[PDB]
Amino acid sequence: DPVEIENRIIELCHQFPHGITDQVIQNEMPHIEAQQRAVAINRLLSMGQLDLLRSNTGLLYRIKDSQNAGKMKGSDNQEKLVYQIIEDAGNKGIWSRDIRYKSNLPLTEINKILKNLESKKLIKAVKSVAASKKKVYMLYNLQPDRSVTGGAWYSDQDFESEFVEVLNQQCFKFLQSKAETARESKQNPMIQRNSSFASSHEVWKYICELGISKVELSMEDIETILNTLIYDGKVEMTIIAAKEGTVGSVDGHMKLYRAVNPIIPPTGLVRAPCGLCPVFDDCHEGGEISPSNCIYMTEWLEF
Amino acid sequence: EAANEAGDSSQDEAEDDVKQITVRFSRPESEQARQRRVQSYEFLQKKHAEE
Amino acid sequence: INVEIKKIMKANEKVTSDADPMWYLKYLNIYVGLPDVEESFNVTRPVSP
Numbered sequence: 382d383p384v385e386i387e388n389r390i391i392e393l394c395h396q397f398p399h400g401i402t403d404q405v406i407q408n409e410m411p412h413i414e415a416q417q418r419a420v421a422i423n424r425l426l427s428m429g430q431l432d433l434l435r436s437n438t439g440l441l442y443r444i445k446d447s448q449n450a451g452k453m454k455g456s457d458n459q460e461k462l463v464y465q466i467i468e469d470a471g472n473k474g475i476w477s478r479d480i481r482y483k484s485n486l487p488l489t490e491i492n493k494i495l496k497n498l499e500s501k502k503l504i505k506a507v508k509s510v511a512a513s514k515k516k517v518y519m520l521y522n523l524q525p526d527r528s529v530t531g532g533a534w535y536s537d538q539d540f541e542s543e544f545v546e547v548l549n550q551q552c553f554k555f556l557q558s559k560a561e562t563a564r565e566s567k568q569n570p571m572i573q574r575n576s577s578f579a580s581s582h583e584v585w586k587y588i589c590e591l592g593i594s595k596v597e598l599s600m601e602d603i604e605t606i607l608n609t610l611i612y613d614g615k616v617e618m619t620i621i622a623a624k625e626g627t628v629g630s631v632d633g634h635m636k637l638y639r640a641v642n643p644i645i646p647p648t649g650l651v652r653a654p655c656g657l658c659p660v661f662d663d664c665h666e667g668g669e670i671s672p673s674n675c676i677y678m679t680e681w682l683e684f
Numbered sequence: 685e686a687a688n689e690a691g692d693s694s695q696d697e698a699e700d701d702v703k704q705i706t707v708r709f710s711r712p713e714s715e716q717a718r719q720r721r722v723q724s725y726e727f728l729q730k731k732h733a734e735e
Numbered sequence: 736i737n738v739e740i741k742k743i744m745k746a747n748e749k750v751t752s753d754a755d756p757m758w759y760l761k762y763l764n765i766y767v768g769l770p771d772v773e774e775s776f777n778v779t780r781p782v783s784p
């Protein structure tokens with residue numbers, strides 16, 4: 382009786398929620414040949430009560446998620462036929478529009494399904510900080526990915542410019558003080574350069590000791606802040622070879638940051654009103670915009 | 685050709701190509717698309733091969 | 736007006752929307768009638784060419 386075989390396979394899948402191999406089924410039921418087991422598995426897959434997984438150990442057969450229920454009003458079929466791609470999205474989330482498009486259902490049905498799932502604590506809706514258009518839906522147990530939502534800089538879908546400005550100012554002050562101490566040490570140029578260098582872990586621990594904000598700042602956060610400072614033309618980073626130490630971030634490589642003065646002072650072009658003029662293209666000898674009747678040069682000479 | 689592609693290196697490391705669960709939605713197919721699938725050549729060939 | 740219009744109506748007798756299934760609009764039979772004028776307030780009247 383193949384029905385008994387299917388029932389036994391379902392019971393075995395109930396016993397092992399993580400899935401069962403063919404070896405487990407053969408050990409539990411040795412008197413049945415491999416062909417009958419294969420036919421039973423094919424029927425179970427055709428009727429939609431089993432799922433196949435390909436692991437490094439082989440094939441696994443897992444019972445389809447039906448016990449985990451959040452929307453029992455109506456049909457469990459649509460509940461699982463939404464929770465499927467809900468879980469498939471998982472940490473990255475998925476907007477309600479994309480859920481509707483993948484489900485090929487009207488907006489009312491999917492709205493009811495999402496509400497009922499939120500009622501029984503199966504899905505959580507979080508606001509997409511990348512593009513504040515709709516609320517993406519994720520699994521309640523899964524931790525929200527920092528890229529799609531959250532972040533040490535984003536606070537309630539609002540970029541904190543003051544926070545990053547304070548971070549940049551404090552890091553630049555620390556690096557400038559370190560470089561000043563290295564210069565005043567004047568023990569040896571190599572020693573001076575090494576002491577002017579500051580590791581990412583060191584400045585990260587310094588910022589943590591400062592405690593400007595309540596949110597915990599990881600090492601890579603301070604690394605990105607220092608990279609933005611590099612892009613500002615104020616500090617310099619060097620990658621040295623160090624196998625292991627107090628940082629242990631990059632394999633065999635450590636980033637050292639030092640405050641460096643600019644190459645040249647402001648050029649002579651910016652000291653003239655013509656170099657900073659926004660309507661410089663419309664300049665002409667005889668016309669409405671002329672150097673003789675210029676307002677910029679007038680205010681500049683008056684000042 | 686697939687074997688030759690896999691054989692680009694003499695010793696192939698154990699690939700961590702675990703089959704992530706790509707179970708697709710059994711989307712309710714529109715009647716027009718269902719009729720297109722029924723009238724498709726692959727469906728007719730499969731129905732012939734069923735015998 | 737006597738045969739072809741009925742065939743055209745039969746070709747598009749049923750129209751329905753994808754959203755909210757089990758809803759439909761079914762045409763049964765179409766008539767052209769006699770020429771009339773809509774001059775009168777909500778009332779028709781025979782009119783000569």
Ligand code: SF4
Pocket residue numbers: 654655658660661664670671672673674675676677678
């Ligand atoms: S408006 Fe005057 S200052 Fe400005 S670009 Fe023209 S000439 Fe130069």
